[PDB]
Amino acid sequence: GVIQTPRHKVTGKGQEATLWCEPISGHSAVFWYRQTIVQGLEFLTYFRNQAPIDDSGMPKERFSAQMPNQSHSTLKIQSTQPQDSAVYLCASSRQGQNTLYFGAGTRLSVLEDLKNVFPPEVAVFEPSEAEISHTQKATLVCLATGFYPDHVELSWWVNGKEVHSGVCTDPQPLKEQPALNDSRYALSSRLRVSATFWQNPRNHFRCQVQFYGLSENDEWTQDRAKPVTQIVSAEAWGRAD
């Protein structure tokens, strides 16, 4: 269906950001919406065949929407501000159709200072001997710590294939320093397998965290490594005894 890029965008205050949406082969296909915790789904703007029809919801400054061709649409924000941070959904609907199809959106995080962006450190912890003995089950745990902002995606890979059944990831990360508003985050996830499965030393477990940060375009003064968008992983092998 509807393809939106990028999936995540981190910018600093005052940077420009443009958001891309490719609708489905259809006419009424702008339905830009903003999605936030406070205001929910908010109509922004609407196009029928490249023609601006309603821009009622668009902020009266800095925000603009265009349709270059009839197979793509853009949302441009000038001079990004923290309040601009949200998920920006794009949607399309056909002619004789009521159904509205949504994109997965672009998550925009506008930070005060890009000097506070850090990527996660990832580590995986092997099941408890006690747990195995008591329940005949083995729970692996993964810890992503010390990352900012909170654009992370955590996945479990068992022998090179990603797995889902028996995964539990925290729905929201925790602030490492919860007093401060601008704090680094941690996330934990659990993978629960049979004790037999863990005991097989040919089984390979990998916890993988996709972090979104700076693009290669962005400048980096500080004497540490620049926190680009990257994958950070940690592995463990099954163990017999």
Binding site: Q39, L41, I53, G103, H134, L140, V141, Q172, A236
Partner: protein, 195 residues
């Protein structure tokens, strides 16, 4: 403009859950409902037109009262996994989809055979993490009253394969004076922590 209630809906597994919406235009003709799983796109789940007053398909019921300008969604026998964000909308003619602000539905799971335990994990070389697991639904992992000790909230897993659900929470610290014995002084179910 469309009002959707409630914003957050905590329902117990097996019980039914209802979301109500109301709209402010006599002209609205189509009322779709969208489910949205974290990270993904809203996906149409069921809809109803001004032609009809109730529809039941796909494990879902919707009502529409045009006179009252209210419509609702009803999910019977909730299971974790109905846990998602839902959204209602009202549309007029060929344009104009006005959406509710959404309902975050949390389905709380019935741990059948709880087995409260607190275990100690290790690896690679802090070093050590503690796992509080298999505790019942009515337990609150509270936050760390020790700074430099971190405790996650509970996490509900549901298997497709078996009819077993489990709760878990993770706690860790770099300190020397830290162990699993006395890490989770929340209102623990009175068992385990056996090493």
């Amino acid at each position: 403009q469309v009002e959707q209630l409630p914003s957050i809906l905590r329902v117990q597994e097996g019980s039914s859950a209802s979301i109500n919406c109301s709209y402010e235009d006599s002209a609205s003709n189509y009322f779709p409902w969208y489910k949205q799983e974290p990270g993904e796109n809203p996906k149409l789940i069921i809809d109803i037109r001004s032609n009809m007053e109730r529809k039941q398909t796909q494990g879902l019921i919707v009502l529409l009262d045009k006179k009252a300008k209210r419509f609702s969604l009803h999910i019977t026998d909730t299971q974790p996994g109905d846990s998602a964000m839902y959204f209602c909308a009202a549309s007029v003619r060929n344009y104009k989809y006005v959406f509710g602000a959404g309902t975050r539905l949390k389905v709380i799971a019935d741990i059948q055979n709880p087995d409260p335990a607190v275990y100690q994990l290790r690896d690679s070389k802090d070093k050590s993490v503690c796992l509080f697991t298999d505790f019942d639904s009515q337990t609150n992992v509270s936050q760390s009253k020790d700074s430099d000790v971190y405790i996650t909230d509970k996490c509900v897993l549901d298997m497709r394969s078996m009819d077993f659900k489990s709760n878990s929470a993770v706690a860790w610290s770099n300190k020397s004076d830290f162990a699993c014995a006395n890490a989770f002084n929340n209102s623990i179910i009175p068992e385990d922590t056996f090493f």
